Amino acid sequence: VPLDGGRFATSDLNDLYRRVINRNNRLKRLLDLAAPDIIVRNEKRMLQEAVDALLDNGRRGRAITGSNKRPLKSLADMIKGKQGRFRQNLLGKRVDYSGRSVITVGPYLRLHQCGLPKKMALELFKPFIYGKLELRGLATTIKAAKKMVEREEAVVWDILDEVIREHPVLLNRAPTLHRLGIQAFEPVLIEGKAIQLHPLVCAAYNADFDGDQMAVHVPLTLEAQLEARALMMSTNNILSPANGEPIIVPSQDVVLGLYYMTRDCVNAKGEGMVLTGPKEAERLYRSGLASLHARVKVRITEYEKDANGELVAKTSLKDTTVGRAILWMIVPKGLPYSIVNQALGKKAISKMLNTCYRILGLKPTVIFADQIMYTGFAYAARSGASVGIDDMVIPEKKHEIISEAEAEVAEIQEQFQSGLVTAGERYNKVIDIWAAANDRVSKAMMDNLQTETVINRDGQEEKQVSFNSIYMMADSGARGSAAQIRQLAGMRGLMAKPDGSIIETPITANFREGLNVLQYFISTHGARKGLADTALKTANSGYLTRRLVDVA
Partner DNA sequence: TCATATTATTACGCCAGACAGGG
Partner DNA sequence: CCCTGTCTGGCGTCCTCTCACCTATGA
Residues binding DNA (CB under 7 A): 3, 7, 9, 15, 19, 22-23, 26, 46, 59, 64-69, 80, 82, 92, 94, 100, 174-175, 535, 538-539, 541-543, 546
Should residue 551 be labelled a site residue for other proteins when binding is judged by CB under 8 A? no
Q: Are the C-beta atoms of residues 35 and 24 closer than 8 Å to each other?
A: no
Residue closer to DNA by CB (options 22, 516) is: 22
Rounded distance between C-alpha atoms, residue 532 and residue 535, angstroms: 5
User: Dihedral (C-alpha) 395, 396, 401, 402: value to the nearest 10 degrees?
Assistant: 80
23 binds, among other proteins, DNA, none (CB under 5 to 8 A by kind): DNA
Q: Which of 489, 471, 445, 485 is nearest to 263 (CA)?
A: 471
Q: Which of 201, 200, 206, 198 is nearest to 250 (CA)?
A: 200
* Contact with other proteins (CB under 8 A) among 34, 535, 540, 551: 535
Task: Report the amino acid identity of residue 154.
Answer: A
- Per CB under 8 A, the segment of 124-132, 310-318, 343-351, 352-360 that binds other proteins is 124-132
Applying the rule CB under 8 A, the residues between 464 and 483 that interact with other proteins are 467, 469-470, 473-474, 478-480
In angstroms, give the least distance from the CB of 283 to other proteins. 15
DSSP single-letter state for residue 12: H
* Contact with other proteins (CB under 8 A) among 36, 137, 175, 419: 175
Should residue 100 be labelled a site residue for other proteins when binding is judged by CB under 8 A? yes
3 binds, among other proteins, DNA, none (CB under 5 to 8 A by kind): DNA
H/E element, 190: strand 182-190
Q: Are the C-beta atoms of residues 84 and 188 closer than 8 Å to each other?
A: no
Should residue 106 be labelled a site residue for other proteins when binding is judged by CB under 8 A? yes
In angstroms, give the least distance from the CB of 246 to other proteins. 18
128 binds, among DNA, other proteins, none (CB under 5 to 8 A by kind): other proteins
List CB contacts of 355: < 8 A, sequence separation 6 or more: 335, 339
124 binds, among other proteins, DNA, none (CB under 5 to 8 A by kind): other proteins
Residue closer to DNA by CB (options 317, 532) is: 532
Measured over the CA atoms of residue 46, residue 51, residue 52 and residue 58, the dihedral's sign is: positive
Q: Half-sphere exposure of 266 toward its Cβ, with a 13 Å CA cutoff?
A: 15
Q: Are the C-beta atoms of residues 172 and 217 closer than 8 Å to each other?
A: yes
Angle between helices 363-383 and 347-360 (to 10 degrees): 150
In angstroms, give the least distance from the CB of 120 to other proteins. 4
In angstroms, give the least distance from the CB of 508 to other proteins. 11
Should residue 193 be labelled a site residue for other proteins when binding is judged by CB under 8 A? yes
List CB contacts of 391: < 8 A, sequence separation 6 or more: 468, 469, 470
Rounded distance between C-alpha atoms, residue 359 and residue 345, angstroms: 21
Task: Classify 27 as helix, strand or coil.
Answer: helix
Should residue 423 be labelled a site residue for other proteins when binding is judged by CB under 8 A? no
Give Dmax over CA atoms of the chain in angstroms. 122
In angstroms, give the least distance from the CB of 34 to DNA. 19
In angstroms, give the least distance from the CB of 544 to other proteins. 12
66 binds, among DNA, other proteins, none (CB under 5 to 8 A by kind): DNA
Applying the rule CB under 8 A, the residues between 486 and 525 that interact with other proteins are 487-488, 497-498, 503, 505, 511-512, 514-518, 520-525
Residue closer to DNA by CB (options 13, 435) is: 13
